[PDB]
Paper text:
There are three paralogs in mammals: ENAH (often called Mena), VASP, and EVL. All three proteins contain an N-terminal EVH1 interaction domain responsible for subcellular localization and a C-terminal EVH2 domain that polymerizes actin.
To understand the structural basis for the high-affinity and selective interaction of PCARE B with ENAH, we solved a crystal structure of ENAH EVH1 domain fused to a 36-mer PCARE sequence to 1.65 Å resolution. Consistent with our truncation studies, our structure showed that only 21 residues of PCARE were fully resolved in the electron density (PCARE828–848). The high-resolution structure led to the surprising discovery that the LPPPP motif in PCARE binds at the expected canonical site, but in the opposite orientation from previously observed Ena/VASP EVH1 domains engaged with proline-rich peptides. PCARE828–848 uses a 14-residue alpha helix-rich extension C-terminal to the LPPPP motif to make additional contacts to an extended region on the EVH1 domain, explaining its high affinity. PCARE residues Phe843 and Leu846 make hydrophobic interactions with Ala83 and Pro65 on ENAH. The side chain of Asp840 on PCARE docks into a polar pocket on ENAH made up of the backbone atoms of ENAH residues Lys69 and Arg81. Interestingly, our structure of ENAH EVH1 domain bound to PCARE828–848 shows that 16 of the 18 residues that are within 4 Å of PCARE in ENAH are identical in ENAH ,VASP, and EVL. Specificity arises from a mechanism whereby PCARE stabilizes a conformation of the ENAH EVH1 domain that is inaccessible to family members VASP and EVL.
Author numbering: 0 to 112, 133 to 153
Write the structure that this text describes.
């Protein structure tokens, strides 16, 4: 009840977008792959994405998933969404990881309801995070 089960695990390079200089930067400040989970909170029926660098366990994404999140499959292997502070981009090691992770995210959202392109307006202007923390 006060614990979270992993419903999905994917390996990915976690990026964050820099609005002012219009480029993607590695989340946490260092290149490298992360292990990214979608966690379901058994008691509260909420979901969270948690990504940690494989090398040193640095937490580079810890993001509540709100009803209505805009999850953009920009390419077969690069998917984007945002929270109140940052715009994330997951560059998956493989189309298979990406398909699994996107599928799990879309299911969670149903329950709740130069190689890399920039985030579109629907992502940049997503206010779904505003339905939380109030």
């Amino acid at each position: 009840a006060m614990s979270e089960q992993s419903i999905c695990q994917a390996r990915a390079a976690v990026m964050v977008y820099d609005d002012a200089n219009k480029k993607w930067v590695p989340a946490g400040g260092s290149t490298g792959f992360s292990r990214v989970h979608i966690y379901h909170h058994t008691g509260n029926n909420t979901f969270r994405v948690v990504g940690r660098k494989i090398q040193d366990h640095q937490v580079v994404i810890n993001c509540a998933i709100p009803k209505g999140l805009k999850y953009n499959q920009a390419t077969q292997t690069f998917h984007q969404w945002r929270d109140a502070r940052q715009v994330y981009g997951l560059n998956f090691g493989s189309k298979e990881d990406a398909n699994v992770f996107a599928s799990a995210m879309m299911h969670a959202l149903e329950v709740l309801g130069e190689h890399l392109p920039p985030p579109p307006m629907e992502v940049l202007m997503d206010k779904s995070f505003a339905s939380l923390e109030s």
